[PDB]
Structure formats: C-alpha cells, structure tokens
Design a protein around this ligand. Structure first.
Ligand SMILES: O=c1ccn([C@@H]2O[C@H](COP(=O)(O)OP(=O)(O)O)[C@@H](O)[C@H]2O)c(=O)[nH]1
Ligand SMILES: O=P(O)(O)OC[C@H]1O[C@H](O)[C@H](O)[C@@H](O)[C@@H]1O
Length: 454
C-alpha cells in the first residue's frame, strides 16, 4: 500500500522545524506521497494543487487563501492550539470565527486530497493543524486506514480545558484509526481526558496500543517517539570538520569553549531563561569570563504574529543586557544570530560545541537535542544540557537534565558540562548513541505503520 503523508508544513522542494525534517527522513526510504500546504499565501485567485515527483516521493501541495491562512494557521492553529498545548494558556487567544475557518480549511484540504487517493492507500496525518482531518475524510466517503501523529505535547487534561472547543477537538481525534503521541506522558494526558472529561474508556492490550472507547467510536492509541538517523548525522558533522563555518568559528573563539543552541525563536523554547542562566554562570564563575561564548542560532518563525514579535523583542533585550555587562574589547559573551542555517552546517558546528544547550519550556521531542548528540566525535564528545520538559528527555539518559525555571540549576549544569572529564563525557555519549540507534526514525515509521495496518 502507498503511504500518503498529510501535514501542513511540507519539506522545501533551509527551513527550521522538526516535523519537516523527521517526516522527510521517514518518507524517503519507503517512498509515497506528501500532501500539504505549499507555504504560499494568495491575495486573490484560486489555489490549484501542484503534483510533482522528486525521486520516490510525490509532492502534492497547494497554496492557502489569505483568509484561510489567517483563520486556520495564524488563528486557531498557532494562536490557540500551539500556546495551549505548550502550557501557555496566558498566550492563548480564541476566536470562534477562526475556529470555524480552521474546521472549514481542514474540510477543503481533505477535498483536495480525495481525488488523488487509491483504494489501498494508507493515510498518515501529522500534527495539530489537522486534528479534524480524519473526520472530514470519512464524511467525504474515504474508507482508507487513517492514522494521526501529534508532534507537539498533548497537554494535561486540565490544561486542555482552556481550549473552549476541546470536546470537538478530541471527538474529531477519535475518527482516526490510530493516534500516535510522542511520549508516555502525552498518551497518559490523552487518556486522562477521555476517562475524566469525555466519559470514555482506555484499556491496555497485548498487541501494544491501548484501545479507546469514546464518543461512540472505537480506536487505538500509543506512544511513538520520533527519532533521527544518528550515524548519518555523525558522518555529516564529520564531513564538515574542515569546512568554512567550522574553520571561522574556531578562529573566532580562539580556544574559548563553545556553548551552542539552535531554536526557532519560539516562546516554547525557554530562550529568556536560557540566556539568564548563562548570565548567572558568568556572575558566579569569574574563571569562565572570556573563556566561553554562547552561540544562539534563533531563526525567525511565524514572524507575522504579535506573540512571536514579543518574544523576539524580549530575547534581544536579554542579549543586549548580558553582553553589555560582561563583554570585553575582545569578547562577546552571547553570539545571537536571527537567521536559518543549513542542517548540514549545524551538524558540523554541533561537533565543535563543548555544550549542547537545549532547554525548552515544553517540547514534543526536540530533534536538535538528538542531532547534537549524534554529531559528536566519540573520541571527544560534548555534553547535552537538556530540559526535563523536552520529550527527548524520556530517553536520553546521558544528558544533564534541568528544569528551565531554575536559573541556578541551569547555570550549575552549564558549569558541570564545561568541566566534565572525558571518560564521563564518553560514557554518556555512548549510552545515548545506543538509544538513538535502536530507536531511529526508520523504526519509528515502521512501528506506527505496523500498528496502523494491524
Ligand atoms: O536554522 C535551522 C534551525 C533548525 N533546523 C532544523 O530544524 C529542526 C528543529 O526541530 P526541533 O524538534 O528541535 O524543534 P521544532 O522547530 O520542531 O520545534 C532540526 O532538525 C534542526 O536541525 C534547521 O535545519 N535550520
Ligand atoms: O511550520 P511552521 O509553522 O513554520 O513551524 C515549523 C514546525 O514547528 C513544529 O515542529 C511543529 O510541530 C511543526 O508542525 C511545524 O511545521
């Protein structure tokens, strides 16, 4: 059967975002179709699907009308769902008219997909934009198997209650044949809502996935943590070891140690707290001054949204304060760059960084954490400092796990990472590489597809 991937964001045919990276890694091996938004917005006219073969993948993409982009994507998806599911009800905005457009765009996108389907296609929908998609497909006569994978956290039921149409969203989720979440706590939160807010049931099974009964429907649900190709990232990082970015980075640092971060400039990424803990490191450790620099690559994301403009402004003021307090004529403590980089360049740079600094307030998985570890030279690997609220913390035992709210704790982790002896750095890296290898992105895809077809 042909695998049909459905997502809002489709890989570029460099972009920051782990969905596009991970889905493309999975899809290029099996081949199939990738259907979704082209990334373009129309002021007038009519969107038209564009079908194009790129090796084993068929891309089927379509623009959004401005009104659809505003209501479905900027509106309900990123002004309601994204903040709510990342435990930011304070940033949640809700507009009934945007929620209706969100529902309408899902139905319109499903209508665009129907003519391309075949009887034995297997449909795999990805992420929070497309929660109503199975319901729309079924209403359009579609009988294929349909699975869903949520890339972002599934919030605690009490937090989900802040989304006014929470019940309609969860009922729509129950039209899927199979629901996949990143981690066990995500699945637990879903089941907690089903049992305690939807009057349904969630039962274990010998097969693996739970059986869900709710809203008159029966379906399955399980956790499938998205992974990477760790040995592929290692070879990529090694192949850049004599490239210009690594060579100029080395020259600029001239023997100073490097703390490195790579994050869309999203309020979910805890970047203000991250900067404050680097500042706290410098306040308390005079020996670290002029001996380390912090590279934060923070590409623009969703920049036409006030909330993203706000977090950008806050972070830029942080960099100015901290640099102003601690800089010397030959030392800039924080190297803040508000631009996207090629993933191949980031891998090469990860391999030169003594510390990978990944401290999101909430994160469904965080591929950057897995990429940082994968890039390391096993003869001399750096240390991952990792938020306990990143989904990757459930499996990456060799990281230094921190609570991003605890500024002192994060600064102490930075000091511990910078001074960690080789033997322990290697032991942690070795353990994590085993985990990443056994639970790579091919295994993830095979596991979900096995459950969806069974
Ligand atoms: O300039 C950049 C920044 C990030 N990324 C990639 O974007 C992904 C980010 O995924 P992650 O899970 O860390 O976070 P997200 O953006 O999905 O919240 C990773 O594969 C990064 O290598 C990239 O290609 N270029
Ligand atoms: O697609 P954007 O809005 O640019 O955000 C980039 C990506 O961020 C996260 O990874 C989301 O889980 C993806 O669904 C999204 O594609």
């Amino acid at each position: 059967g042909r695998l049909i991937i459905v997502s809002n964001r489709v890989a570029p045919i460099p972009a920051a975002g782990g969905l596009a990276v991970g889905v493309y890694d999975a899809l290029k091996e099996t081949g199939g179709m990738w259907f979704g938004w082209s990334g373009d917005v129309l002021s007038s006219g009519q969107p038209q699907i564009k079908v194009e073969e790129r090796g084993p993948v068929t891309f089927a993409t379509i623009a959004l009308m401005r009104r659809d982009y505003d209501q479905y994507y900027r509106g309900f998806s990123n002004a309601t769902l994204w903040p709510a599911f990342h435990y930011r009800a304070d940033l949640l905005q809700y507009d009934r008219h945007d929620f209706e457009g969100y529902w309408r765009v899902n139905a319109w996108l499903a209508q665009q997909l129907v003519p391309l389907l075949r009887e034995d296609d297997v449909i795999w929908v990805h992420d929070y934009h497309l929660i109503p998609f199975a319901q729309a497909l079924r209403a359009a006569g579609v009988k294929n198997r349909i699975g869903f994978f949520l890339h972002i956290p599934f919030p605690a039921s009490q937090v989900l209650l802040a989304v006014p149409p929470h019940r309609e969203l969860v009922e729509a989720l129950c039209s899927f044949d199979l629901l996949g979440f990143q981690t066990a706590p995500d699945l637990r939160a879903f089941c907690d809502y089903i049992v305690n807010e939807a009057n349904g049931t969630a039962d274990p099974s010998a097969s693996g996935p739970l059986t869900i009964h709710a809203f008159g429907r029966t379906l399955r649900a399980a956790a499938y943590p998205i992974g990477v190709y760790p040995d592929e990232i290692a070879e990529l990082a090694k192949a850049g070891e004599r490239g210009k970015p690594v060579r100029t980075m080395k020259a600029t640092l001239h023997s100073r140690k490097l703390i490195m971060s790579v994050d869309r400039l999203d309020y979910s990424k805890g970047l203000v707290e991250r900067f404050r803990a680097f500042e706290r490191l410098l306040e308390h450790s005079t020996a670290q001054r002029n001996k380390v620099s912090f590279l934060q690559i923070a590409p623009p994301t969703r920049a036409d949204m006030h909330a993203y403009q706000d977090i950008r402004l806050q972070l830029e003021g942080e960099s100015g304060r901290i640099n102003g307090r601690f800089a010397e004529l030959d030392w800039t403590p924080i190297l803040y760059i508000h631009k996207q980089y090629e993933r191949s360049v980031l891998a090469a740079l990860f391999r030169t960084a003594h510390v990978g600094y990944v401290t999101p307030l909430r994160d469904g998985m965080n591929l950057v954490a897995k990429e940082y570890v994968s890039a390391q030279d096993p003869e001399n690997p750096g240390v991952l400092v990792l938020s306990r609220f990143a989904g990757a913390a459930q499996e990456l035992d060799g990281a230094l796990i921190v609570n991003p709210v605890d500024i002192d704790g994060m600064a102490e982790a930075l000091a511990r990472a910078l001074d960690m002896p080789l033997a322990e750095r290697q032991a942690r890296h070795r353990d994590m590489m085993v985990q990443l290898r056994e639970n790579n992105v091919s295994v993830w895809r095979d596991n979900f597809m096995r459950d969806l077809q069974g």
